[PDB]
Each structure stands twice: as C-alpha cells, then as structure tokens.
Amino acid sequence: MIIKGRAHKFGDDVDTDAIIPGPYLRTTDPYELASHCMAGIDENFPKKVKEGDVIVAGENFGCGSSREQAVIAIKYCGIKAVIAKSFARIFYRNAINVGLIPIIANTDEIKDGDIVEIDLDKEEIVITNKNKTIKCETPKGLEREILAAGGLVNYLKKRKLIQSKKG
Amino acid sequence: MIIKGRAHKFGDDVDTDAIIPGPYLRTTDPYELASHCMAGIDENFPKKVKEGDVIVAGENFGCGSSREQAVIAIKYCGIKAVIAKSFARIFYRNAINVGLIPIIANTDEIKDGDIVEIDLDKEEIVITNKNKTIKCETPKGLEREILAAGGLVNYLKKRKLIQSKKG
Ligand SMILES: [Zn+2]
Ligand SMILES: [Zn+2]
C-alpha cells in the first residue's frame, strides 16, 4: 500500500513528553489525546496536521517512557506512519501494537512541508516535490503481520477466528 | 488529503446484495462483513483488496436496501473511498455516516488495476499509470464535516465536547 501526505519534520530525541505531555495523560478519549499531539515541542501541530499526514523525525523518536498514549495521540490525528532515523525500542513496539507504522530512513533527505509518498511494498519514500526517492526499511516478520491486521487486538481476534472454524 | 491505491473496477447498478449478500447479514463483527465485500459479483475481491485501495464503479452504486452493513463491509476492507458515476441516495448517506468517502467522477476513464490518486482538496483523480487526471466531485457542507470527523458518531461527540467546555 501507499501512504501519501504532508511531512511534519522534527529533530532528534523527540520523547514521549514532547509527543503527549504528562498532564494530558489524565483522559480516556484517544481523540482528546490526539488534540495535544506533539504539543510538547510544537503547540501548532494539532491545528496544522491533517488525516493522512506523516510525522518525520531524527534519531531516537519516541524516546523515554512506556506510554501507549503517545502512539495513540499520533494514530488518532489520522497519522498512519512515522518516518525516523531510529525509534526508541518501547515506542516502536507500542506503535506496532496500535497499527501505527514506524518507518526507518535518512530523514535528513526530508524537509518540513514536503509531500511524501511511502510505498510499503517497494520500501521507498518518494519526495514528490523534490524529484527524489529514498530507500526506507519497513517492519518485517511478526511486527509486519500485527501491523497488517491493524494492531495487536485485531491480530489476536483473527487468530481466534481461524481457531473457531478449526473445530 | 490524498488517497492513493489500486482501483477495483465494477459496472453499473452494483447493489447492496452484490456488495454484501443478505445471508452474511447475520453477524456482528464488521471484519466478518468485510471478508465478504463485493462477494455478490466478485468472489475474489476479499482476497485481492488491500488496505488503501479504492472501489471504482459505474452508475447507481450501492443501489437497493438500506444496509449499513454494505458501507461497513467496504470500510472494514481498509477502503477509504468509492469512486462512481452516481450513488444510490441511501448508500451515499450511510457512507458519509461511517466515514466512507463517496466520490463522483466519469469512471469510464478508470480501468481495473489502475493506480489512482484522489486529491480531495483539488478535487481531481490522478490515474498515475495512464498519465491523465480527471475532475471529481467530493462531498460538501454538512456531509463534508461529518466525513472530516470520520463519521456521524465522532461528529456528534465533537459537538458535545465543544458544548462541554462551553459551560
Ligand atoms: Zn531522549
Ligand atoms: Zn439497482
């Protein structure tokens, strides 16, 4: 599949608090969380982002705390993927489990406002307004399957469903 | 935003039964419904469709019965939009209410398997593999707002949320 949208570029070490400040963690509504996505470093993000857009960052994106809210804040902004040079281990796992696609690439090649086209099958990112394409690395194995199902929950109910018609 | 994927082309008068045969209506799981999307005319659709793809049809798509399951079957296949020459009135309404985007265009310009790029802001559909772009008509007014919120439910809770912080 192909994910195409506007890129919102950030730097290195964008941690969970920058993604979704601790004080907002006192809410249930995921959309409530989404309304403050990236508010830690860019108070204008929630008002600029559009469904289908992509967050682009530097090294160690999602750094810090084991917050499922961080990935939920991103996912509920209508963002299907995050492109970064590297991802904090815990964030990566949480992203996979909620259906948020973590993509690895040299983000120095991407500028804020660029229109990017991520082709998950070819594992390339076309930066349409810059007439260039860069390679990327998408999730594989189990993580790819969980992502394909849209998250851990779906993956598990599809596993049960199969077992259902098994007898 | 931009929706880009592979087009699955169908003809005129594709009714709700073709979209989701009556016998399957005895289920709760939307994914269960999705597994038989378009099974009425193409038993291979469920196995060919990929998240991000687009259904393209002729006149009067969604014809017939007031089945919310038809739009749910499409939406749960990972299909965000349906491009047709015209839409049955009831289907159109149901689509809007679940966040499925009904787009009007001369689909004779689109062939099965074409890669299409729907730009909702420019109201154009780029048929990338055919080096051509055609105009389309996207939803406006209230319908556009409901769609933007992702469905009637979200639209309503966003209306309440606003009222909440009002006093
Ligand atoms: Zn850090
Ligand atoms: Zn009919």
Side-chain angles (χ1 to χ4, degrees):
Chain A
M1 80 180 261
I2 291 171
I3 293 170
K4 179 165 180 172
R6 187 178 297 299
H8 295 88
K9 185 168 194 177
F10 299 87
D12 296 317
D13 202 53
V14 177
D15 65 59
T16 52
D17 284 302
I19 295 172
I20 180 67
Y24 303 110
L25 303 179
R26 305 188 68 172
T27 181
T28 298
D29 198 304
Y31 284 113
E32 193 64 52
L33 288 171
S35 65
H36 296 93
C37 186
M38 310 308 289
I41 48 181
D42 181 16
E43 62 286 356
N44 299 160
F45 185 78
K47 306 296 179 173
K48 300 173 179 174
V49 66
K50 300 298 180 183
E51 186 188 340
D53 283 352
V54 179
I55 288 174
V56 178
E59 301 280 22
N60 195 39
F61 184 83
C63 174
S65 307
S66 50
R67 311 307 174 183
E68 289 135 47
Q69 290 96 316
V71 301
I72 290 180
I74 297 171
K75 179 184 182 294
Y76 279 74
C77 272
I79 295 174
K80 180 64 174 184
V82 176
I83 306 173
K85 291 185 181 180
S86 62
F87 290 96
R89 303 179 64 275
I90 296 180
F91 176 87
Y92 190 91
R93 179 180 68 65
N94 291 338
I96 298 296
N97 292 328
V98 298
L100 179 59
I101 306 166
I103 294 167
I104 295 177
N106 179 6
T107 59
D108 291 339
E109 299 290 351
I110 306 171
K111 297 296 185 175
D112 187 60
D114 280 338
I115 300 303
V116 299
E117 196 178 310
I118 304 169
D119 188 316
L120 303 178
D121 289 321
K122 299 186 188 180
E123 287 191 292
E124 306 183 309
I125 295 169
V126 183
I127 310 177
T128 67
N129 58 302
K130 293 296 208 298
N131 289 318
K132 62 174 181 178
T133 303
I134 65 181
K135 290 186 177 174
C136 66
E137 166 168 46
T138 63
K140 301 291 187 305
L142 182 57
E143 283 147 44
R144 177 166 49 184
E145 299 184 304
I146 293 173
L147 283 178
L152 187 53
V153 176
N154 291 338
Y155 173 80
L156 293 179
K157 67 178 180 181
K158 280 182 173 56
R159 199 180 74 181
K160 293 180 183 297
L161 173 56
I162 298 175
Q163 289 300 299
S164 177
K165 65 182 66 176
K166 185 182 180 181
Chain B
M1 80 180 261
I2 291 171
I3 293 170
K4 179 165 180 172
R6 187 178 297 299
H8 295 88
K9 185 168 194 177
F10 299 87
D12 296 317
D13 202 53
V14 177
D15 65 59
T16 52
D17 284 302
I19 295 172
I20 180 67
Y24 303 110
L25 303 179
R26 305 188 68 172
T27 181
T28 298
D29 198 304
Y31 284 113
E32 193 64 52
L33 288 171
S35 65
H36 296 93
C37 186
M38 310 308 289
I41 48 181
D42 181 16
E43 62 286 356
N44 299 160
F45 185 78
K47 306 296 179 173
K48 300 173 179 174
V49 66
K50 300 298 180 183
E51 186 188 340
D53 283 352
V54 179
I55 288 174
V56 178
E59 301 280 22
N60 195 39
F61 184 83
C63 174
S65 307
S66 50
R67 311 307 174 183
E68 289 135 47
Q69 290 96 316
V71 301
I72 290 179
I74 297 171
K75 179 184 182 294
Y76 279 74
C77 272
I79 295 174
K80 180 64 174 184
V82 176
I83 306 173
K85 291 185 181 180
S86 62
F87 290 96
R89 303 179 64 275
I90 296 180
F91 176 87
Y92 190 91
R93 179 180 68 65
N94 291 338
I96 298 296
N97 292 328
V98 298
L100 179 59
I101 306 166
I103 294 167
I104 295 177
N106 179 6
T107 59
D108 291 339
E109 299 290 351
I110 306 171
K111 297 296 185 175
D112 187 60
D114 280 338
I115 300 303
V116 299
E117 196 178 310
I118 304 169
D119 188 316
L120 303 178
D121 289 321
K122 299 186 188 180
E123 287 191 292
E124 306 183 309
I125 295 169
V126 183
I127 310 177
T128 67
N129 58 302
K130 293 296 208 298
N131 289 318
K132 62 174 181 178
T133 303
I134 65 181
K135 290 186 177 174
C136 66
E137 166 168 46
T138 63
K140 301 291 187 305
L142 182 57
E143 283 147 44
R144 177 166 49 184
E145 299 184 304
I146 293 173
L147 283 178
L152 187 53
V153 176
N154 291 338
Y155 173 80
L156 293 179
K157 67 178 180 181
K158 280 182 173 56
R159 199 180 74 181
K160 293 180 183 297
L161 173 56
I162 298 175
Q163 289 300 299
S164 177
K165 65 182 66 176
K166 185 182 180 181

